[PDB]
Amino acid sequence: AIAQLATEYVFSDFLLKEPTEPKFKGLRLELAVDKMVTCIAVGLPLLLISLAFAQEISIGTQISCFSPSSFSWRQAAFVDSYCWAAVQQKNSLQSGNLPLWLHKFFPYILLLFAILLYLPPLFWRFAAAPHICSDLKFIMEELDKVYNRAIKAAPIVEQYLKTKKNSNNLIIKYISCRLLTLIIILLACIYLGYYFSLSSLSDEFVCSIKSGILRNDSTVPDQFQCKLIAVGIFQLLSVINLVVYVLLAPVVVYTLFVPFRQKTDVLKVYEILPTFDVLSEGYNDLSLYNLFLEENISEVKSYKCLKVLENI
Amino acid sequence: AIAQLATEYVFSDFLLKEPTEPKFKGLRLELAVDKMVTCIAVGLPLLLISLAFAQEISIGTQISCFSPSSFSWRQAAFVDSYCWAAVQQKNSLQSGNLPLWLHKFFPYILLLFAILLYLPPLFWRFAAAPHICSDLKFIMEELDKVYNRAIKAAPIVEQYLKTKKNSNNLIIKYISCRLLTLIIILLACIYLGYYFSLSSLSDEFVCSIKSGILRNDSTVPDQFQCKLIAVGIFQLLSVINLVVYVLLAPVVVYTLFVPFRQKTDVLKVYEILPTFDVLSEGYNDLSLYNLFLEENISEVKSYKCLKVLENI
Amino acid sequence: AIAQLATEYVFSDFLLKEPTEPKFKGLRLELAVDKMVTCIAVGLPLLLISLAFAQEISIGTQISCFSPSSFSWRQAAFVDSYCWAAVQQKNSLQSGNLPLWLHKFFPYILLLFAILLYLPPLFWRFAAAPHICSDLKFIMEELDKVYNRAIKAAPIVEQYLKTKKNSNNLIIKYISCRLLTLIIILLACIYLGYYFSLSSLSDEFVCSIKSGILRNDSTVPDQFQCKLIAVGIFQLLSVINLVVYVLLAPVVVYTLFVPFRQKTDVLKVYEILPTFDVLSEGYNDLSLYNLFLEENISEVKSYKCLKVLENI
Amino acid sequence: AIAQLATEYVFSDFLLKEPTEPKFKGLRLELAVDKMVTCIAVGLPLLLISLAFAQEISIGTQISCFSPSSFSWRQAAFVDSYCWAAVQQKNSLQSGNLPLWLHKFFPYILLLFAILLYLPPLFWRFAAAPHICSDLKFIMEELDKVYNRAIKAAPIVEQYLKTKKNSNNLIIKYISCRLLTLIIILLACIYLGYYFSLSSLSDEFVCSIKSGILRNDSTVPDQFQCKLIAVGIFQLLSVINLVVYVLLAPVVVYTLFVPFRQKTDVLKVYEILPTFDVLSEGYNDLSLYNLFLEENISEVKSYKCLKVLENI
Task: Identify residue A104 by its one-letter amino acid code.
Answer: K
| CA C159 from centroid of its chain's CA atoms | 37
Q: How far apart are CA B189 and CA B176, in angstroms?
A: 19
Beta strands in chain D (DSSP E): 63-66, 206-207, 224-228
Exposed e or buried b per residue across A216-251, where buried means at least 16 C-beta atoms within 10 angstroms of its C-beta: eeeebbebbbbbbbbbbbbbbbbebbbebbeebbeb
3-state secondary structure of A227: strand
Q: Is D278 exposed, middle or buried (0-12, 13-18, 19+ CB in 10 A)?
A: exposed
* Phi/psi of residue D262, nearest 5 degrees: -75, 160
3-state secondary structure of A179: helix
Tell me if C75 and B76 make a contact (CB, 8 A cut-off).
yes
Can you give the C-alpha Rg of chain B in angstroms? 28
Which DSSP category does A117 fall into?
A: T
Q: How far apart are CA B229 and CA B168, in angstroms?
A: 52
Whether chain B has a CB inside 8 Å of the CB on C81: the answer is: yes
Based on DSSP, count helices (H) and strands (E) in chain A, helices before strands.
13, 3
Count Cβ atoms below 10 Å from residue C208 Cβ, excluding itself.
21
Tell me if B209 and A66 make a contact (CB, 8 A cut-off).
yes
* A64 to chain B, closest Cα gap in Å: 5
Q: How far apart are CA C34 and CA A276, in angstroms?
A: 62
Whether chain A has a CB inside 8 Å of the CB on B13: the answer is: no
Q: How far apart are CA D283 and CA D258, in angstroms?
A: 7
**Nearest CA among B117, B131, B156 for reference residue B39:** B117
* ∠ CA B115-B117-B120, rounded to 5°: 105
Name all contacts of A251-254 with Cβ < 8 Å and 24+ positions apart: A251/A33, A251/A36, A251/A37, A252/A37, A252/A178, A252/A181, A252/A182, A252/A185, A253/A182, A254/A33
- For C21-49, give the secondary structure using H, E and C: CCCCCCCCCCCHHHHHHHHHHHHHHHHHH
Say which residues have a Cβ less than 8 Å from residue A192's Cβ, sequence separation at least 6: A238, A239, A241, A242, A245
**Nearest CA among C185, C177, C164 for reference residue C256:** C177
* Phi/psi of residue B181, nearest 5 degrees: -65, -40
Exposed e or buried b per residue across A197-209, where buried means at least 16 C-beta atoms within 10 angstroms of its C-beta: ebeeebbbbbbbb
Q: How far apart are CA B197 and CA B190, in angstroms?
A: 10
**Nearest CA among B175, B186, B173, B170 for reference residue B117:** B186
| CA A105 from centroid of its chain's CA atoms | 19
Q: How far apart are CA C144 and CA C138, in angstroms?
A: 10
Tell me if D77 and C95 make a contact (CB, 8 A cut-off).
no
Task: Determine the residue among C4, C8, C9, C11 to mutate to test chain D binding: the one whose Cβ has the most chain D Cβ atoms within 10 Å.
Answer: C11
* ∠ CA C233-C235-C239, rounded to 5°: 120
Closest-approach residue (CA) in chain C for D77: C64
Q: Is D42 exposed, middle or buried (0-12, 13-18, 19+ CB in 10 A)?
A: buried
Tell me if B131 and A298 make a contact (CB, 8 A cut-off).
yes
Tell me if C42 and B11 make a contact (CB, 8 A cut-off).
yes
Half-sphere CA count of A256, side-chain side, radius 13 A:
14
* Phi/psi of residue A66, nearest 5 degrees: -80, 95
Tell me if A204 and B211 make a contact (CB, 8 A cut-off).
yes
The H or E element that residue A207 is part of is: strand A206-207
Which DSSP category does D61 fall into?
A: -
- D 134-153 residues with CB < 8 A to C: 134-135, 137-138
Whether chain A has a CB inside 8 Å of the CB on B61: the answer is: yes
Backbone discontinuities in chain A, residue before each (C to N > 2.5 A): 95, 154, 279
Task: Identify residue A160 by its one-letter amino acid code.
Answer: Y
* B224 to chain A, closest Cα gap in Å: 15
Tell me if B67 and C75 make a contact (CB, 8 A cut-off).
yes
Count Cβ atoms below 10 Å from residue C151 Cβ, excluding itself.
12
- Its sign, for the CA torsion D36, D39, D41, D47, is negative
| Neighboring chain B residues of C231 at a CB cutoff of 8 Å | none
Q: How far apart are CA A87 and CA A99, in angstroms?
A: 10
Name all contacts of C275-282 with Cβ < 8 Å and 24+ positions apart: C275/C146, C275/C149, C275/C150, C276/C146, C276/C150, C276/C155, C277/C155, C277/C158, C279/C158, C279/C161, C282/C168
Q: How far apart are CA B278 and CA D211, in angstroms?
A: 84
Q: How far apart are CA C2 and CA C50, in angstroms?
A: 8
Q: How far apart are CA D95 and CA D225, in angstroms?
A: 10
Question: Which of A56, A77, A224 is nearest residue B53 as measured by Cβ atoms?
Answer: A56
| Neighboring chain B residues of A223 at a CB cutoff of 8 Å | 213
Tell me if C204 and D213 make a contact (CB, 8 A cut-off).
no
| CA A153 from centroid of its chain's CA atoms | 51
Say which residues have a Cβ less than 8 Å from residue D60's Cβ, sequence separation at least 6: none
β-pairing, A206-207 with B206-207? unpaired
Whether chain A has a CB inside 8 Å of the CB on B5: the answer is: yes
DSSP A258-306: HHHH--GGGGGGGGGSTT------SS-HHHHHHHHHHHHTTSSHHHHHH
* Phi/psi of residue A40, nearest 5 degrees: -70, -45
**Nearest CA among D23, C49, D245, C101 for reference residue B7:** C49
Beta strands in A95-139 (DSSP E): none
Question: Which of B72, B74, B118 is nearest residue A11 as measured by Cβ atoms?
Answer: B118
Count Cβ atoms below 10 Å from residue D25 Cβ, excluding itself.
12
Q: Is D89 exposed, middle or buried (0-12, 13-18, 19+ CB in 10 A)?
A: middle
Is the distance from CB of C259 to CB of C283 less than 8 angstroms? yes
Is the distance from CB of C181 to CB of C252 less than 8 angstroms? yes
Method: cryo-EM
Is the distance from CB of B44 to CB of A3 less than 8 angstroms? no
**Nearest CA among C16, C31, C25 for reference residue C255:** C31
Say which residues have a Cβ less than 8 Å from residue A80's Cβ, sequence separation at least 6: A61, A63, A64, A65, A67, A226, B74
Q: How far apart are CA C224 and CA C66, in angstroms?
A: 6
Task: Identify residue C107 by its one-letter amino acid code.
Answer: P
Which DSSP category does A225 fall into?
A: E
Is the distance from CB of C38 to CB of C121 less than 8 angstroms? yes
- D 87-116 residues with CB < 8 A to C: 87-89, 91, 105, 107-108, 111, 114-115
Q: How far apart are CA C1 and CA D98, in angstroms?
A: 26
Task: Identify residue B24 by its one-letter amino acid code.
Answer: F
* Phi/psi of residue D207, nearest 5 degrees: -75, 170
Which DSSP category does D298 fall into?
A: T
Say which residues have a Cβ less than 8 Å from residue D85's Cβ, sequence separation at least 6: C203, C227, C228, C229, C230, C231, C232
Q: How far apart are CA D270 and CA D143, in angstroms?
A: 9
List, edge to edge, every strand of the sheet that includes B63-66: B63-66, B224-228, B206-207
Is the distance from CB of A100 to CB of A87 less than 8 angstroms? yes
The H or E element that residue A64 is part of is: strand A63-66
Whether chain B has a CB inside 8 Å of the CB on C130: the answer is: yes
Is the distance from CB of B306 to CB of B270 less than 8 angstroms? yes
Is the distance from CB of A275 to CB of A152 less than 8 angstroms? no
N- to C-terminal Cα separation, chain C: 55
* Phi/psi of residue A28, nearest 5 degrees: -80, 105
Q: How far apart are CA C86 and CA B232, in angstroms?
A: 9
Closest-approach residue (CA) in chain A for B118: A11
* C243 to chain D, closest Cα gap in Å: 13
Q: How many CB pairs under 8 A join C and D?
A: 143
3-state secondary structure of D110: helix
- Diameter of chain D measured on Cα atoms: 104
Whether chain B has a CB inside 8 Å of the CB on A305: the answer is: yes
Is the distance from CB of C279 to CB of C264 less than 8 angstroms? yes
Q: How far apart are CA D29 and CA D295, in angstroms?
A: 10
Task: Identify residue D110 by its one-letter amino acid code.
Answer: L
Q: How far apart are CA A279 and CA A270, in angstroms?
A: 10
- Diameter of chain A measured on Cα atoms: 104
Is the distance from CB of A234 to CB of A266 less than 8 angstroms? no
Helix axes A119-127, A129-151, angle to 10 degrees: 50
Q: How far apart are CA C100 and CA C226, in angstroms?
A: 11
3-state secondary structure of D48: helix
| Neighboring chain C residues of D116 at a CB cutoff of 8 Å | none
Q: How far apart are CA D86 and CA D94, in angstroms?
A: 11
**Nearest CA among C257, C110, C234, C235 for reference residue C184:** C110
Exposed e or buried b per residue across B169-178, where buried means at least 16 C-beta atoms within 10 angstroms of its C-beta: ebbbbbbebb
Helix axes A119-127, A32-52, angle to 10 degrees: 140
Q: Do chains D and C touch (3 or more CB pairs under 8 A)?
A: yes
Q: Do chains C and A touch (3 or more CB pairs under 8 A)?
A: no
- Its sign, for the CA torsion A126, A127, A130, A132, is negative
CA distances to A31, A99, A250, B46, B127 from A261, in Å: 12, 42, 14, 38, 15
N- to C-terminal Cα separation, chain B: 55
Say which residues have a Cβ less than 8 Å from residue B63's Cβ, sequence separation at least 6: A59, B80, B83, B84, B226, B227, B228, B229
* Phi/psi of residue A86, nearest 5 degrees: -85, 50
Q: How far apart are CA D283 and CA D178, in angstroms?
A: 14
* Phi/psi of residue A225, nearest 5 degrees: -90, 115
Task: Identify residue B114 by its one-letter amino acid code.
Answer: A
Q: How far apart are CA A55 and CA B60, in angstroms?
A: 9
3-state secondary structure of A201: helix
Question: Which of D14, D111, D214 is nearest residue C225 as measured by Cβ atoms?
Answer: D214
Closest-approach residue (CA) in chain B for A64: B78
Is the distance from CB of A44 to CB of A244 less than 8 angstroms? yes
Q: How far apart are CA B180 and CA B170, in angstroms?
A: 15
Say which residues have a Cβ less than 8 Å from residue B39's Cβ, sequence separation at least 6: B14, B15, B16
The H or E element that residue A228 is part of is: strand A224-228
Q: How far apart are CA B178 and CA B253, in angstroms?
A: 8
Whether chain C has a CB inside 8 Å of the CB on B18: the answer is: yes
- B 205-224 residues with CB < 8 A to A: 209, 211-214, 219-220
Whether chain C has a CB inside 8 Å of the CB on B239: the answer is: no
Can you give the C-alpha Rg of chain C in angstroms? 28
**Nearest CA among C72, C104, C74, C296 for reference residue C205:** C104
- For chain C, give the secondary structure using H, E and C: CHHHHHHHHCCCCCCCCCCCCCCCCCCCCCCHHHHHHHHHHHHHHHHHHHHHCCCCCCCCCCEEEECCCCCCHHHHHHHHHHHHHCCCCCCCCCCCCHHHHHHHCHHHHHHHHHHHCCHHHHHHHHHCHHHHHHHHHHHHHHHHHHHHHHHCCCCHHHHHHHHHHHCCHHHHHHHHHHHHHHHHHHHHHHHHHHHHHCCHHHCCCEECCCCCCHHHCCCCCCCEEEEECCCHHHHHHHHHHHHHHHHHHHHHHHHHCHHHHCCHHHHHHHHHCCCCCCCCCCCCHHHHHHHHHHHHCCCCHHHHHHHHHHCC
Task: Identify residue B276 by its one-letter amino acid code.
Answer: F
Q: How far apart are CA B162 and CA B285, in angstroms?
A: 10
Tell me if D130 and C298 make a contact (CB, 8 A cut-off).
yes
N- to C-terminal Cα separation, chain A: 55
| CA C165 from centroid of its chain's CA atoms | 30
Task: Identify residue A132 by its one-letter amino acid code.
Answer: I
Neighbouring-strand partners of residue D63: D228
Q: How far apart are CA A11 and CA B41, in angstroms?
A: 12
- For chain B, give the secondary structure using H, E and C: CHHHHHHHHCCCCCCCCCCCCCCCCCCCCCCHHHHHHHHHHHHHHHHHHHHHCCCCCCCCCCEEEECCCCCCHHHHHHHHHHHHHCCCCCCCCCCCCHHHHHHHCHHHHHHHHHHHCCHHHHHHHHHCHHHHHHHHHHHHHHHHHHHHHHHCCCCHHHHHHHHHHHCCHHHHHHHHHHHHHHHHHHHHHHHHHHHHHCCHHHCCCEECCCCCCHHHCCCCCCCEEEEECCCHHHHHHHHHHHHHHHHHHHHHHHHHCHHHHCCHHHHHHHHHCCCCCCCCCCCCHHHHHHHHHHHHCCCCHHHHHHHHHHCC
Is the distance from CB of C286 to CB of C165 less than 8 angstroms? yes
Tell me if C230 and D85 make a contact (CB, 8 A cut-off).
yes
